[PDB]
Design a protein around this ligand. Structure first.
Ligand SMILES: C[C@@H](Oc1cc(=O)[nH]c2ccccc12)c1cn(-c2ccc(Cl)cc2)nn1
Ligand SMILES: C[C@@H](Oc1cc(=O)[nH]c2ccccc12)c1cn(-c2ccc(Cl)cc2)nn1
Ligand SMILES: C[C@@H](Oc1cc(=O)[nH]c2ccccc12)c1cn(-c2ccc(Cl)cc2)nn1
Ligand SMILES: C[C@@H](Oc1cc(=O)[nH]c2ccccc12)c1cn(-c2ccc(Cl)cc2)nn1
Ligand SMILES: O=c1[nH]cnc2c1ncn2[C@@H]1O[C@H](COP(=O)(O)O)[C@@H](O)[C@H]1O
Ligand SMILES: O=c1[nH]cnc2c1ncn2[C@@H]1O[C@H](COP(=O)(O)O)[C@@H](O)[C@H]1O
Ligand SMILES: O=c1[nH]cnc2c1ncn2[C@@H]1O[C@H](COP(=O)(O)O)[C@@H](O)[C@H]1O
Ligand SMILES: O=c1[nH]cnc2c1ncn2[C@@H]1O[C@H](COP(=O)(O)O)[C@@H](O)[C@H]1O
Lengths: 349, 349, 349, 349
């Protein structure tokens, strides 16, 4: 009926579809604030979270992330005991902040119990499809048992899903269905929402409740992070940009004189190992990047420049005030180096 | 006059132009129903049909397709006796469902007579241009002689053509002009309709009569099938995705240590062999895929995931309720794995 | 003022932006008429003209084109005596039709005088920018001296230019600024109009006077020709598709065991040889195609198919009634063979 | 609030998104005027300025540019004494025009003092983000001390920024944030405005005050320059198109038998040498082009053709009257040579 007619009405934008419009500024990049408050008990000095993936974040990454002012989410592909131990390892390293991923399973509360005993700062109820009754029920259950626990729930890509998770008791909503570098959800299932639109739609709803959103996935360059925050996210979550730094789990492997690390979807064959569901992610390799610090300095540096250009003395200004301009593929081609043969790779390109 | 002014008004979308929007779900992929009813006497457990092409479907493919819950269309590039024998071969293999392709020719009724004697379940009146008087007349003729016979007629790409075939007596309409992987109609003749729009337009009309449509051609990934069904098709027909499985006709050929099978348009030089019309298809090779079962499991698995994401407990929900969001080429680039070097090929990518 | 505000309002479409929509047909490709009337004294059995270029048309090409039912334009990069001799050569070959190109120069009337004495059927006043006072004045001058002479004037890309040439006395208008395969006008000068829009806009005007237009340039496949005619042109002019056939001027040259012929813009350095203007065309090579007949049979065959699909029993129906549907780059990708490794090249792809 | 709703409303066009529409002309390319007046004391015979970059313009380039009728901006990556000496070198070479770049620094006035003593014709206050209070304050300060000095200020990309610089006292505004060939601002910071839209928006404002704008960056072909001027700029500034000519600074380097010169962003690691800011430009190499004269002749030749096509007897006509037509990526593909194998490189392609 009405739904038949509306089938093709909506349009969505992703990072490469837009640029931020420069505005009047009296702030230099080095003077801007990149601090962000997710809740009364979860305040970050930089708006970056490392993904809860088995090739991105265990304790060493979470420690390094927290020291940089961000947050690491310890992944769930390990025993309850192992995960609680990893969380504890971060906490004893100076009381740094740490998060931990939990799936929607029968043993989820048991896992959460142990993580809370280990002093975890946030639980991520991490699911392929956040807008499901199973997730909502689990959030309600956790919130009822743990009234003060930071609950990040996702992933979602619509205002309605956002509303549903907030009402169930989530105090942070994680946004992103299909944008991940290692993701095949869009190809396998045909499902997704271009990430900038997802963030904006979800932020529009979350704003109404004073709830922050995390822009998760699809960020390839520091400028994409600026765009995600300007689209309304309080913070971003990164997988590929952190895979391959020294502190990520996994060994550095050498092939034809170059150092690589494995990076894979949590929905890839190998990760799911560690009718039945078909994979929704791939396994790959990324160049070894060296220490996390060097990568974070480039990311935050890019954000500082973007904020300076937008006249954003802080992230709240950026979310509330920054404006985009839409462009075509031709626009995109102009927006990367062109017609010159690059001889040195830059630290941020 | 009016037609002069309307020349460039219409716009069309294809698979890569859109994504399905995730919606509230209380169904897991393994719990959804993928059954579909084409008519009282033609009910499929999975919404897949193998193309009536001489490099896709003869009896072995049709048997394997039927056992998986789908349907095979035996191609028409053989004698009447040979085709009837192939149909009979499928029927004696446990009374499985089978379809058979027939062209618009003088000997079409003779061919149909033999196929009906062999207990065929559906005839496909298969033509390059379904919206022609020749096709309409043939459908009327067949329907008059065989009041209870399932008649699938096509191909078409517009509401008007759909209306015309239904009124002539077709009880299933096959949709697709120009989307095929091996098709050159669009390049040679300049004619076609982007496939998602074709399906939607044709379904809009067919719905009015309670008539199902088949989305035929252009499907490259399991997600495209989800999109076709969500655009209104009851089922899809596949050529390239089934070419190269063990049960397809033709020998496996080896070149530089790799196994390939031939896949060609029915409008290619070679197929037409087996002024005068210029070819509208090409001849190529596809990688050997192994048994049909493995490919069908990946396809249906992808559909199950897509339905779960859309909260579609069955295909009727998907057709009636699923919503799309339009994206740009940038959207498409985000929607495939990006900026990571894939090291293992996935079973579904 | 008003002109400042309108600077970016117009939009233009080219061949790859659209497809023709299939319509009700009771005509087979072999039954359609491809005849076209340009004037009382210029009637073509096929709607194809070979370009007046020094690597496309001299007498041998013009003879072959005329025998196929089309028309050749003898190029102007030769002496007056040589050109008149070439025209005469065509006329004595059975009184076949022939055209001849003339520039806007002081000696243009002298050249035209000789061509008329040689019994030329049409003069092409061939200029880079048809919408100029020099061209208009030359047309008026020629028309005054030769009231019954077929005058094809161009090139233009707008309704206003079309109106101006018709009022000056041109009885055929040639359309195309910047679409040519060998053209660099758009890159060098920044000027042009996407060719399908140019044809449609110019045809809209010319129709008002009962004047035909020629769609000149940019045609890469037989389907592009169908699109040009459906956009309103009576006929098309081809350069690249005829370069390299046996009857085109120039030697067949062999490089690494393959036969090529030179094809170059008339605005390329070499052609202009045979402050000062910068080149607006390039010099290249095209594969040797064999005899003109084989190429024309493929072109006309493609047109016949397109007409059949559109239900166009003749070209007037196509111009007046055929409808397009707009598509994206994704649409284009679906509209060529995809995801299959082509093993044999087709005669029309 | 309102700003939240407007976030994605604006759209922007760049060079490759449009073509100029041919119009009635009675002017040949060789007859048009390409002169332009930037101020009472800054009149150029050709509308070209070479970029103030350490791989583009020092005294030799500025001398060659001025002799061609244009202007060179001496870059600021040298001591105050060195820059004043370079300016003096140009002035003593026949009193040719010369400009000089100055940053927003504490020592800016000291640098300007010396440049004025050396008889510089224009100061370029050259900054990454022109729409900042620091820039506005510096312009006001310079204008107060030097009431008659030509002050070019930038870069900006919006009407508001343009208004702000003009009110502060700039008499020429330089437009371009992110379009440069060597620029990574858009990737690193996520900020920019497609250049044709930037020029048009800024010109719309500047026009109101009788102030000219310079279209700076992103020009890859002579046709892009025509488009920039037609979008409203009085003149263009070029980096990449002048890098690699004999008169640019830096040595010609030989690698595998080919001559190259270094070309780099002023925001690249190396240039910035000659927390802390991350780079916003890359370092590369461009082919050696020979003398500046040959490149300028091709550029101006392209402009002359474009003007002829537009019927623009002068640049004021072009800015005020020329019209564009928007195209898709398909339009772009038609607008470059296609389907022909180029055998000779042209002087302008
Ligand atoms: C194949 C596997 O993929 C993932 C596994 C995983 O750990 N995380 C993911 C995140 C995003 C997308 C996919 C995954 C997976 C997919 N699904 C899944 C898909 C759809 C629904 Cl409705 C419910 C579940 N559940 N597990
Ligand atoms: C060249 C050959 O191609 C096909 C032959 C074929 O068996 N099936 C096809 C399916 C789709 C597109 C083309 C073919 C063919 C084309 N046509 C054809 C084209 C247009 C009309 Cl109106 C009528 C017939 N009839 N046979
Ligand atoms: C460089 C040369 O190019 C061509 C030379 C030629 O013989 N034919 C052409 C057709 C289309 C485009 C360009 C040419 C040429 C360009 N122009 C030219 C360009 C613009 C105007 Cl207003 C007037 C003339 N006149 N000759
Ligand atoms: C990294 C460096 O890059 C440039 C350095 C430079 O000399 N010129 C540029 C021109 C355009 C873009 C960047 C540069 C640079 C960037 N910024 C900068 C960026 C944003 C603001 Cl708000 C203020 C300054 N200041 N210097
Ligand atoms: O296999 C999967 N399929 C789909 N998405 C995934 C998968 N694994 C992780 N993700 C998501 O992708 C994000 C990483 O995206 P990236 O920063 O672009 O590499 C994660 O934080 C998850 O939200
Ligand atoms: O040669 C042909 N030209 C155009 N379409 C064809 C031709 N042969 C088969 N088809 C169509 O293409 C479909 C297969 O498309 P595929 O699944 O993309 O490979 C078939 O089911 C037919 O509808
Ligand atoms: O050098 C030139 N510059 C621009 N257009 C040209 C030039 N030479 C020929 N043309 C045009 O290009 C057409 C050929 O285009 P084609 O069929 O795409 O190769 C000719 O008929 C002319 O209209
Ligand atoms: O490193 C930088 N980052 C961004 N823009 C730059 C940088 N250096 C120079 N530019 C700009 O880029 C222009 C040159 O652009 P080009 O003509 O496309 O090569 C200069 O005139 C500056 O406006």
């Amino acid at each position: 009926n009405a739904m038949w007619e509306s089938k093709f009405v909506k349009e969505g934008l992703t990072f490469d579809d837009v640029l931020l419009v420069p505005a009047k500024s009296d702030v230099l990049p080095r003077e801007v604030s990149v601090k962000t408050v997710l809740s009364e008990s979860l305040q970050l000095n930089i708006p970056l979270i490392s993904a809860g993936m088995d090739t991105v974040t265990e304790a060493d990454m979470a420690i390094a992330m927290a020291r940089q002012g961000g947050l690491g989410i310890i992944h769930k592909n390990m025993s309850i005991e192992q995960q609680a131990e990893q969380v504890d390892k971060v906490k004893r390293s100076g009381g740094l902040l740490v998060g931990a991923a939990v799936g929607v399973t029968a043993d989820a509360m048991t896992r959460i119990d142990a993580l809370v005993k280990a002093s975890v700062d946030a639980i991520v109820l991490d699911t392929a499809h956040g807008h499901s009754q199973g997730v909502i029920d689990k959030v309600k259950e956790v919130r009822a048992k743990y009234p003060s626990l930071n609950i990040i729930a996702g992933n979602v890509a619509t205002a309605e899903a956002t509303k549903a998770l907030i009402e169930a008791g989530a105090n942070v909503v994680k946004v992103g269905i299909g944008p991940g570098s290692i993701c095949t959800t869009r190809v396998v299932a045909g499902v997704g929402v271009p990430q900038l639109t997802a963030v904006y739609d979800c932020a529009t709803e979350a704003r109404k409740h004073g709830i922050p959103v995390i822009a998760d996935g699809g960020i390839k360059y520091s400028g994409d992070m600026v765009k995600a925050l300007a689209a309304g996210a309080h913070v971003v979550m990164l997988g590929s940009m952190f895979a391959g730094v020294a502190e990520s789990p996994g060994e550095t492997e050498i092939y034809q004189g170059r150092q690589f690390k494995v990076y894979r979807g949590m929905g890839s064959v190998g990760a799911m190992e560690k009718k039945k569901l078909v994979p929704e992610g791939i396994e790959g390799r990324v160049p070894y990047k060296g220490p996390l610090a060097d990568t974070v300095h480039q990311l935050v540096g890019g954000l500082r420049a973007g904020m300076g250009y937008c006249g954003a003395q802080d992230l709240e200004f950026l979310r509330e005030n920054a404006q985009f301009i839409r462009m075509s593929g031709a626009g995109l081609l102009e927006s990367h180096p062109h017609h010159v043969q690059i001889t040195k790779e830059a630290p941020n390109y």
